[PDB]
Design a protein around this nucleic acid. Structure first.
Ligand SMILES: [Cl-]
Ligand SMILES: [Cl-]
Ligand SMILES: [Cl-]
Ligand SMILES: [Mg+2]
Ligand SMILES: [Mg+2]
Ligand SMILES: [Rb+]
Ligand SMILES: [Rb+]
Ligand SMILES: [Rb+]
Ligand SMILES: [Rb+]
Ligand SMILES: [Rb+]
Length: 135
RNA sequence: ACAU
DNA sequence: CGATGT
């Protein structure tokens, strides 16, 4: 209903899907960029959205922050809830990097705890998430 | 259909 | 137009 401005927002950016994947996290209130992942040569939009949330979890945990995370990705929110990224992307030599990061993110979720609420950014009511790439 |  | 997902 109301934006929780005291929060972290994350988003993926890509060149192609599958294609070059990156992601970032911003302070919802100000747009300040808090983290950015170096581009990964081949991945999917949803793998990037998933990695972005998990990185946000790890970022806030390290800083003892109880802020929620906003994502616009129905898929990635569910994957994080399940601790399982159900991606269709073929596992081969050229997707090995994205799949390593996805596998490592699942592994982190399965060995750590957090109470961070992971919230759906309501794009239809609020406009584009503040972490959007503008592509 | 909804979310990207 | 195409692709990723529930
Ligand atoms: Cl990552
Ligand atoms: Cl909350
Ligand atoms: Cl959701
Ligand atoms: Mg997004
Ligand atoms: Mg976006
Ligand atoms: Rb901590
Ligand atoms: Rb967008
Ligand atoms: Rb965009
Ligand atoms: Rb969106
Ligand atoms: Rb579809």
């Amino acid at each position: 209903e109301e934006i929780i401005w005291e929060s972290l927002s994350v988003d993926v950016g890509s060149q192609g899907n599958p294609g070059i994947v990156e992601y970032k996290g911003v302070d919802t209130k100000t747009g300040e960029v808090l983290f950015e992942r170096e581009p990964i040569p081949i991945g999917t939009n949803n793998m990037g959205e998933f990695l972005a949330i998990v990185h946000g979890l790890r970022y806030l945990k390290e800083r003892n922050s109880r802020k929620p995370i906003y994502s616009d990705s129905q898929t990635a929110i569910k994957w994080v809830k399940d601790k399982k990224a159900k991606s269709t992307l073929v596992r081969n030599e050229e997707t090995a990097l994205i799949w390593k990061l996805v596998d490592e993110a699942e592994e982190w979720l399965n060995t750590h705890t957090y109470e961070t609420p992971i919230l759906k950014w309501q794009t239809d009511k609020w406009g584009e998430i503040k972490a959007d790439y503008g592509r």
